[PDB]
């Protein structure tokens, strides 16, 4: 058995990226940036966590059919940074992450976990910075960690 993930202090968000380049840049430099409203959502979660648990980010390139990895948020959002570092010059700011897992996990492995906070839609049909209830996030993390 693996009873590791079955902890009550942690918050977990879906990250959608239009760009494979942004994923590569995030993995290379351990940084990320979302939309304005996505940044505010993540920043609020990171700050109210106050180091008492992780904020996990589950990354998926839009339309790709698979998740591509897992990162931990490692800083609050800096909203005034160099512009144009991502594929679109549509992102304002920067925060630190630490990539934990870089591996492709097909949506078929996860489509049966549904989100009660998002109309019971499959976790694989989430939008950018959709938050995942902790008890569903535990199931997703265990599937990602064991996939091969
Ligand atoms: C630099 N970070 C990013 N790069 C590429 N797409 C991003 C999104 C997104 C927003 C709406 C729909 C799908 C994706 N949010 N942050 C993104």
Curated annotation (Swiss-Prot):
Signal peptide: none annotated. Belongs to the YTHDF family. YTHDF2 subfamily. RNA binds at residues 16-18, 22, 32-33, 62, 86, 91. The disordered regions have the ability to interact with each other and to 'phase separate' into liquid droplets within the cytosol following binding to mRNAs containing multiple m6A-modified residues. This leads to the partition of m6A-containing mRNAs into membraneless compartments, where mRNAs may be stored, degraded or used to transport mRNAs to dendritic arbors in neurons. This is YTH domain-containing family protein 2. Highly expressed in induced pluripotent stem cells (iPSCs) and down-regulated during neural differentiation. It comes from Homo sapiens. Changing residue 86 to A: Reduced binding to N6-methyladenosine (m6A)-containing RNAs. Reduced ability to undergo liquid-liquid phase separation. It is found in: Cytoplasm, Cytosol; Cytoplasm, P-body; Cytoplasm, Stress granule; Nucleus. It comes from the Eukaryota. The gene is YTHDF2. Interacts with CNOT1; interaction is direct and promotes recruitment of the CCR4-NOT complex. Interacts with YTHDF3. Interacts with RIDA/HRSP12; interaction leads to recruitment of the ribonuclease P/MRP complex.
């Amino acid at each position: 058995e693996n009873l590791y993930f079955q902890m009550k202090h942690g918050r977990v968000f879906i990250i959608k990226s239009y760009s494979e380049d942004d994923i590569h840049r995030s993995i290379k430099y351990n940084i990320w940036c979302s939309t304005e409203h996505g940044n505010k959502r993540l920043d609020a979660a990171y700050r109210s966590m106050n180091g008492k648990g992780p904020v996990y980010l589950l990354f998926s390139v839009n339309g790709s059919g698979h998740f591509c990895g897992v990162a931990e948020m490692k800083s609050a959002v800096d909203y005034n940074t160099c512009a144009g570092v991502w594929s679109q010059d549509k992102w304002k700011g920067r925060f630190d992450v630490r990539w934990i897992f870089v591996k492709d996990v097909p949506n078929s492995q996860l489509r049966h976990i549904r989100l009660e906070n998002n109309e019971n839609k499959p976790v694989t049909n989430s939008r950018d910075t959709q938050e995942v209830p902790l008890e569903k996030a535990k199931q997703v993390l265990k599937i990602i960690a064991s996939y091969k």
